[PDB]
Motif scaffolding. Structure first.
Motif, PDB file in Angstrom:
ATOM      1  N   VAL A  10       0.692  -1.163   0.091  1.00  0.00           N
ATOM      2  CA  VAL A  10       0.001  -0.038   0.017  1.00  0.00           C
ATOM      3  C   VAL A  10       0.852   1.248   0.024  1.00  0.00           C
ATOM      4  O   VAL A  10       2.048   1.081   0.309  1.00  0.00           O
ATOM      5  N   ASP A  11       0.441   2.443  -0.659  1.00  0.00           N
ATOM      6  CA  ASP A  11       1.139   3.686  -0.683  1.00  0.00           C
ATOM      7  C   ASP A  11       0.236   4.661   0.052  1.00  0.00           C
ATOM      8  O   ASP A  11      -0.749   4.774  -0.289  1.00  0.00           O
ATOM      9  N   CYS A  12       0.879   5.527   0.830  1.00  0.00           N
ATOM     10  CA  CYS A  12       0.387   6.626   1.608  1.00  0.00           C
ATOM     11  C   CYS A  12       0.996   7.819   1.030  1.00  0.00           C
ATOM     12  O   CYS A  12       0.792   8.953   1.689  1.00  0.00           O
TER      13      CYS A  12
ATOM     14  N   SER B  91      -1.640  10.889   0.919  1.00  0.00           N
ATOM     15  CA  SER B  91      -2.148  11.300   2.302  1.00  0.00           C
ATOM     16  C   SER B  91      -0.815  11.963   3.021  1.00  0.00           C
ATOM     17  O   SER B  91      -1.000  13.007   3.767  1.00  0.00           O
TER      18      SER B  91
ATOM     19  N   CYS C  39      -6.217   6.386   5.145  1.00  0.00           N
ATOM     20  CA  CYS C  39      -5.555   5.378   4.152  1.00  0.00           C
ATOM     21  C   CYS C  39      -4.294   4.333   4.647  1.00  0.00           C
ATOM     22  O   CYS C  39      -3.662   4.843   5.080  1.00  0.00           O
ATOM     23  N   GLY C  40      -4.884   3.015   4.579  1.00  0.00           N
ATOM     24  CA  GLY C  40      -3.988   2.227   4.858  1.00  0.00           C
ATOM     25  C   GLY C  40      -4.011   1.583   6.217  1.00  0.00           C
ATOM     26  O   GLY C  40      -3.204   0.896   6.806  1.00  0.00           O
TER      27      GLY C  40
END
Lengths: 258, 258, 258, 258
Positions: A196-198, A201, B72-73
């Motif tokens: 996953v990529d943040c 955000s 997010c995540g």
């Protein structure tokens, strides 16, 4: 009562449940003599601090011959057994589409014609057309093409090349023969790390993996088999994974048998 | 496998069995995420000199929240758990009408509007409708009215008033909060003693009690709950007692799951 | 001399007594070669302080084959052996109707078509028709219907639901396979506790059990059998219990053979 | 199995064998309840330097009573037991006419009206019909009259008076009551010594005895008996000695059971 059907084309071989422990669940085909039948041993556990489940299927297949008419005075008898185990690792706090896509890749991994020749004819994986040796895994119309990155003495590591280096698809195939050259042992393993990529955000966030989910295989093939016996073992495991009972056993942990 | 159905109106929530020990017997619902699901830890024993059984149900309910859309995540995760235990004591030499009436009174204890407000809105028991504070436990057309005899700061004892003084119905409600005011603890208990007399057979014989049979409850409610989180815990337990399997678990001691 | 006649329809297989110890008593069928014959080993003891007897029948059956015509120069030989044991427990101070009713249930338990398929086709007991899985044990026109109350991994406990909780009919079937999947082992056990009520004499008296009397079974089935060999073992034991010599052995302790 | 038939008139009571040791040999009747039945503990020995045998019978008789009709909840139970033992001593080098005469005297001892009243109505031995207190033992047409020689407080010795003074018949009766006056003990004993005279061959040779053979009795009668309880015990022992199997047990040393 509780049944799984396995279509091998137009012929269906329905298994019936014969034993049910807390987690273990033994199926069997009720046709023919009592000495050697199809067997299916499902299981479901959760190891450690309740964080990861563990599914474990095991399809046995004994080759029974009955020579009572030719040789006078003898009974049916099991020549050999050939198994195809599975070992799925599902983490508890996963999302549904991660373990649905894990099932969708393994359903298309068994259904390809390169794992067919690996179990039936013992040919290793990977075929080169325009570059290196690749396996395509269509999950519908999208084809996740793995490329071979390594070829050891027995091991053979495949990997997908799209995306970051931290989490990628994998295939550590193997092929052995134990002892006095009497039985082979194929061993596939498909890793799927959920990256996953943040970046949208948080500033400057490089991608990282959350968990991992595997689906191992463990095929046992005896050396003096019939080629029609290795073909029927592959055709039942191709039909077992394609059922909707094993789909709910991996995605939703619903036990087998309806 | 073996299922129990809990009708909450027209919505049916079927719990399937995931464990079967010699005494413990765990059920779970299979719909939804893998981290927070329904739970039903049934049990049965016979402690001491093999004369008294002990049914022990426990309906857990966790409130899982998933906001990977917002943050997010992140992964699904449970906030709190709210349980509703049971503890039935059945003596082995009972008559069948004793075990049936104890089930029929507790089936009507949970189904009344005063225990519903006790676990949802934390309102204490007893509603004075022209007289004393009374609870009506309808068993069809027969209504058994228990009047309040003592309201201490912790306990709240109810008791029926017809018949002899030696054996009567009881209802010992309570309400606590342990720790840093985070969770409440409701505690009902229904005592039923079997009284018999043979003054028509043996002269000078006053009534006396043979045995007694309890059905206590132990609800755990966290203080920062949702209203529909407490309303659904009551609606499942009201539908659990009203099934035909918990009836036969108390009357005939057959375990759950068909 | 001293004979037991087992009719399997119109064909009668007459066993003759070959050995008589104090308690042990061995019968044998004198037809055919000397290597494998029908066997019947009756016994009768009294264990402990002369308070309970122990009848112990055991019917062996060897499957011989004489392959001298096809293969030149070889003798008849025993391929396998399938037994059906019994182990009756009779307390000394019983009632004759307690011994007669225990024999009448076991005579009707073996003669049903569910225990037939359990030893011939290895499918478990109980058939669900309008409710749960039941076995009907008619003792004439009175049918005592046992209902299944438990289904463990191998065990299967049936129970009659009429009457008090302290003493009821029990039936704990089982099914195993010991070792390297070479032989099964069916194991029935029918308990019959004698409950009595003193309510017409003493008020406040709940029913209690005075003794208990069992009739176990221990069937051994080898896996590579013929289906006609498992059918023949059941058909002899169905007709052995139905004889009037085993009726007087359990009711009146008269030894076998006339 | 092996049976002894004791005709008590027109009613025949058949004892069947329940034990066969090297010497001991237990018989038992099979009609009736299982707790109180007839018993016949036969035996045979040869003690010392292989010169004298020892027959040893023991006829137990239990008075069972079952009154579950009167008091609700009891089982059949044994009140008392009344035995009639025998202790025969046979020297190995005897004459067959001396072993037959010892049997014919004891068969006629039990069959007289003076031993019948001794065990039933406890009347002592000897009735004076014109002379001394005599017992008549008819062996057909030959009558052997034994006159009383000594009657102390315990013993009562009879003896024949014809023939020489060195070897004569004997009858040593006695009667006791041991314990708290609850059980009697009748004790008969018949000595027969074989005398021979060699005066026709060797001059100056007076008669002398070469061997003696006994037949003791040991009857146990409890004081609060029924009259038909002692009358049936006498009628069984009178019918036991009159059989053709106890004749061959003394004459030809053949063990019991045909």
């Amino acid at each position: 009562s509780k049944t799984i059907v396995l279509s091998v084309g137009e012929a269906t071989r329905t298994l019936t449940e014969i034993q049910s422990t807390a987690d273990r669940q033994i199926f069997e085909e009720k046709v023919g003599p009592l000495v050697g039948r199809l067997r299916l041993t499902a299981s479901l556990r959760q190891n450690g601090a309740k964080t990861a489940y563990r599914v474990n299927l095991k399809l046995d297949q004994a080759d029974v011959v009955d020579c009572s008419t030719s040789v006078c005075g003898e009974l049916p008898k099991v020549r050999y057994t050939q198994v195809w185990s599975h070992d799925v690792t599902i983490v508890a706090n996963s999302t549904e589409a991660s373990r649905k896509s894990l099932y969708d890749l393994t359903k298309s991994l068994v259904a390809t014609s390169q794992v067919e020749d690996l179990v039936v004819n013992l040919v290793p994986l990977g075929r080169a057309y325009g570059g290196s040796k690749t396996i395509v895994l269509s999950v519908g119309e999208a084809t996740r093409t793995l490329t071979e990155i390594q070829s050891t003495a027995d091991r053979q590591i495949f990997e997908e090349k799209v995306g970051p280096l931290v989490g990628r698809l994998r295939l550590t195939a193997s092929l052995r023969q134990n002892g006095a050259k009497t039985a082979y042992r194929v061993n596939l393993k498909l890793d799927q790390a959920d990256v996953v990529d943040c970046s949208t955000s948080v500033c400057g966030e490089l991608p990282k993996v959350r968990y991992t989910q595997v689906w191992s295989h463990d095929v046992t093939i005896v050396a003096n088999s019939t080629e029609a016996s290795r073909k029927s073992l592959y055709d039942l495991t191709k039909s077992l994974v394609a059922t909707s009972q094993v789909e709910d056993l991996v995605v939703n942990l619903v036990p087998l048998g309806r």
